[PDB]
Curated annotation (Swiss-Prot), chain B:
Keyword rRNA processing: no
Main subcellular location of this protein, as a coarse class: virion
InterPro entries cross-referenced by the UniProt entry: Satellite_virus_coat_sf (IPR037164)
Subcellular location(s) of the protein: Virion
Leftover remarks: This virus depends on tobacco mosaic virus for its replication.
Organism: Satellite tobacco mosaic virus
Protein name: Coat protein
GO molecular function: structural molecule activity
Keywords, comma-separated and alphabetical: Capsid protein, Virion
A cellular-component GO term for this protein: viral capsid
Source superkingdom: Viruses
Curated annotation (Swiss-Prot), chains C, F:
Entry's localization field: Virion
A single GO molecular function term of this UniProt record: structural molecule activity
Name of the protein in question: Coat protein
SUPFAM superfamilies recorded: Satellite viruses
GO cellular component: viral capsid
Keyword Nucleotide-binding (UniProt): no
Keywords linked to the UniProt accession: Capsid protein, Virion
Miscellaneous: This virus depends on tobacco mosaic virus for its replication.
Species of origin: Satellite tobacco mosaic virus
Amino acid sequence: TGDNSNVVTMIRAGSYPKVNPTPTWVRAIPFEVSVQSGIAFKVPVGSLFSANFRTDSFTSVTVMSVRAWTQLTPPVNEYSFVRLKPLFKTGDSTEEFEGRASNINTRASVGYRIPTNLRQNTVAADNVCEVRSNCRQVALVISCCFN
Amino acid sequence: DNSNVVTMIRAGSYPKVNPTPTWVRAIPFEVSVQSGIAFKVPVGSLFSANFRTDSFTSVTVMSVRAWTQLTPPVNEYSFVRLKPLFKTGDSTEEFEGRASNINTRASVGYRIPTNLRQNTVAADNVCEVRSNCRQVALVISCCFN
Amino acid sequence: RGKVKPNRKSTGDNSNVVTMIRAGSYPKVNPTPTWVRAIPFEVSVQSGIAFKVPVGSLFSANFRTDSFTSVTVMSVRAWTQLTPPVNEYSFVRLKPLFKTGDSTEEFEGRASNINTRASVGYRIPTNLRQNTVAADNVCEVRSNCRQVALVISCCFN
Amino acid sequence: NSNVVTMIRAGSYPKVNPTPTWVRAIPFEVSVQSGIAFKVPVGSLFSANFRTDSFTSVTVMSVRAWTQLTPPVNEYSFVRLKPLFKTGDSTEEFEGRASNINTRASVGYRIPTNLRQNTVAADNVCEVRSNCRQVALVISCCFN
Amino acid sequence: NSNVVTMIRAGSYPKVNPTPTWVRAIPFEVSVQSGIAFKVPVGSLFSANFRTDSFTSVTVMSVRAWTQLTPPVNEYSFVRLKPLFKTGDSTEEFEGRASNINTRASVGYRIPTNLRQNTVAADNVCEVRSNCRQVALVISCCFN
Amino acid sequence: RGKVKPNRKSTGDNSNVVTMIRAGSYPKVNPTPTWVRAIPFEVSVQSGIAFKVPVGSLFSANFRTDSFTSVTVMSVRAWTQLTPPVNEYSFVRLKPLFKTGDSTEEFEGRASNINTRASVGYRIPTNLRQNTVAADNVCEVRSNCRQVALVISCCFN
Amino acid sequence: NSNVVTMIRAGSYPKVNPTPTWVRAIPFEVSVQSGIAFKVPVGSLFSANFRTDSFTSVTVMSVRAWTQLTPPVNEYSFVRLKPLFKTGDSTEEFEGRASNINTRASVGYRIPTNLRQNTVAADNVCEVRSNCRQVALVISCCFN
Amino acid sequence: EEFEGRASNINTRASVGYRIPTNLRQNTVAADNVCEVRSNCRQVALVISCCFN
RNA sequence: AAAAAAA
RNA sequence: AAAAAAAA
RNA sequence: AAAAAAAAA
RNA sequence: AAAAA
RNA sequence: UUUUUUUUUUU
RNA sequence: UUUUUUUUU
RNA sequence: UUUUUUU
RNA sequence: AAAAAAAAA
RNA sequence: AAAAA
RNA sequence: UUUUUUU
RNA sequence: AAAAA
Ligand SMILES: [Cl-]
Ligand SMILES: [Cl-]
Ligand SMILES: [Cl-]
Ligand SMILES: [Cl-]
Ligand SMILES: [Cl-]
Ligand SMILES: [Mg+2]
Ligand SMILES: [Mg+2]
């Protein structure tokens, strides 16, 4: 109804505009990490830069929120759990944001938001957070802005 | 927003995710053009690391805008023409724009109606450019997928 | 009231002589306050090579910003300061740079008249507005014109 | 709000001024002898201690004074201000006295718009009298 | 109303000024020679005859003039005023003429706020011209 | 907006320092503009004879009207400048004069007190307000008083 | 707000407290044995793992319990809670069962305001019974 | 910046304080420094409003 | 409602 | 909805 | 709400 | 919402 | 702030 | 009334 | 308005 | 109305 | 309602 | 509000 | 409706 045409139509363009071949890009990047029992795993910021995510052209990224799900079943007799400790170059946190499953067959999950005042860039050498989980793998979805 | 520290998120089930999403983009690039000769613009010029788009193999072109990128010949006013090209059938429209000041760029563009917005691959061509200026700058509004 | 007298200040904003100020307790003072500023300055650029703009350029007599050692940059605007090569329309790119991580943006503006300055700028989000010292960099500049004019909106502190 | 950089569709090159003006409250102290008036020099307003050394002229709007040290024994602090001007010094002795010996005396005065001309380092703002040996000043002024 | 004294629940010692300012209309005459302009000295404003001798500087707001003596034979009185300023004398000849020989000529002029700076005894307010030998002046001014 | 900074102009009509003016294209100027003026001057008259007032009297240092060679006269007012003969009440007549044709009007005013100036004037209709040069005349003046004061409302151009 | 530091016109020194109170939900687990009640020690709430090693007393508000491990074969998880109080233990057996063997049982109880006195590490919150060999507790309490 | 505050009674404390804008509210570890303190008084009491994490 | 045009 | 520590 | 893109009497 | 009663 | 040429679907 | 921690609907 | 992100 | 006296969230 | 058009 | 005074 | 942003 409110459609347009079935043919090409002239554009009365004007002065050459402002342009940017390499713009920013708000993204939710999904990737997994392996975790050993009882040992915290530091999540490298570098996992976010990759051709798998179309983000290999970026070197910096502003992480906004971190969410995590256990990716494999827990040990026998156990309910899946997962923890997150936010890491920041200006000072690591000591928080242990933990989510557990209520059904052994179900993923545990938890996440944390980064306040605006702590949303600085990070590079591949930097770490996002420590992860702990009685499951050997953890799936993460990181809401981050690539720039 | 007024918060100053990390806060828990009571996340739930694992979400539907997509590591290689689409991206709506305006891609600026330039092409060399010879006097009196038409130059087919390759769609492959849109897939390059310079645009963060080498990971794409297809692109739905929406609109095309061209500006003369160099001065015109002596005594002449810049001008640039576009002939949209389509795999299903090239057009014959010559959307032409002429500068009214010799020192000023000549610009023109054309929109692709929804019914012709299919994907194009690197080997495809967007449109034929013509111009008395040896280089034409192009801004192509397109959807990478 | 319960009047005294003196003075001669005629109706509010129309006094012709000095008038006493019933000042009170010594206030909170600051001899060295901050200063939000639009700093104009130029940088030289070679065709094809990036030039990292030092934050130190902002601290200078020419700007009165001498006493400062740190600055919070808000936005950066750029103009080509010189004509372009023959046959060319001016252009200028800006790549923001941060200590926590350099960006890969190339905010570019081009002139539509050869005689006219190409211009472009970019805003720094609040979450990236930390201080920067002289040794720090602001942005990479590229330009077919040999000199680029910059105006940097920042807060000195 | 925005979490990444955003382009600024800037335009023509604007009107700039690398050396803009500055309205300031400049605090500084002066030494005062008993019974002797001290001519406060305008030059004390120019100094890197205030970021104002890049200035050579200043428009004084108002002047406020507080005694900076205790008064003599048995005495309540006090301070006087006599506005001075290049076109003609005034004879007003704007006085303020403490009502608690342990507390500062203060007082100040406003300069009408018609007397707000520039002054230079050589010039004098006002005479200051006080039974206290030091007087803290805060001068509202426009550096230009 | 009250017919006896009543206590005043006074409080802390206020801000005082023994030598305050004063806005005044100062009348005084000046001797004028035929055809010759007379520079009216600002010093005539300072005098115990006006209670203003305690002042050394004064801000002039407006100046009014009247012829103080009769004019020549066959002539109507007249008076001229040319405002004088330290930053730059003016060239206006504000004139007023009597329409009845037996009556005074007058005229005056207002000083804009931006030219109301202090003046001292040495300075001159304005030139005065008149066919009458004396000119009565009334100067609205602020003594400070 | 999209802010810069500097300055210190406090609320409209209360600035204490210089403030930048974002001037633009060079305007239309005029170094020698017109000037509408009330020109006072006196003329001498003999009892019983008319005196043609020259327009040149208006161009003079004493009026700042030096640079002008032409003037459009709007209205002419006249006053007797000196006392009348013994026993007489002052009087003054004005006969307007024009290059296209002198008028035969004698606009006359008389004093009702011997001590008082007789006064009179006349307005020139728009359709007679052409320019006049020094060699031109304005009006004939008559008066039992030997000197007549004139104030001529005109436009210099 | 702004992008730079701003002065705070602070006043008199305020009332301060270096060791304030803290309202918390303390998660921790306890080992349980089949058919045997386990008394939960309040002392479990005082640990550097919870940032509460600095507290020596705590007011318990509510107690919620989940089975932390799978139940025996062919059984649905269940957990009971028997509140305990120094002034007098309760006999309530607040019990929750799982309706899906693979799902946590859960239950909890509230402590009325009149029974919310302080407890120390030696005291006991409640008895826990369960067919599961570990029970996860989350105790809402005010550390003081 | 030298945010200064003085007492108007010799027997009374001088105070002053400052706020950190949001764009400068990053974390700080023990090694870091908050602010320089100057005073003609031998001991300055401080009250720092902060967010531990 | 699409397209070429027109103030 | 509320309580506790902190800002306004 | 953020990010990229996209127009007329 | 940076800097003066 | 009411106004050409060819198509044409619903109303 | 906003930030942080916790219950309640 | 259309894409990616979070309420 | 004058004079003396007499208070809180 | 003391002192300036 | 209560005393002394006058409307 | 003569002369300044
Ligand atoms: Cl299930
Ligand atoms: Cl381009
Ligand atoms: Cl041009
Ligand atoms: Cl008064
Ligand atoms: Cl400003
Ligand atoms: Mg051209
Ligand atoms: Mg269980």
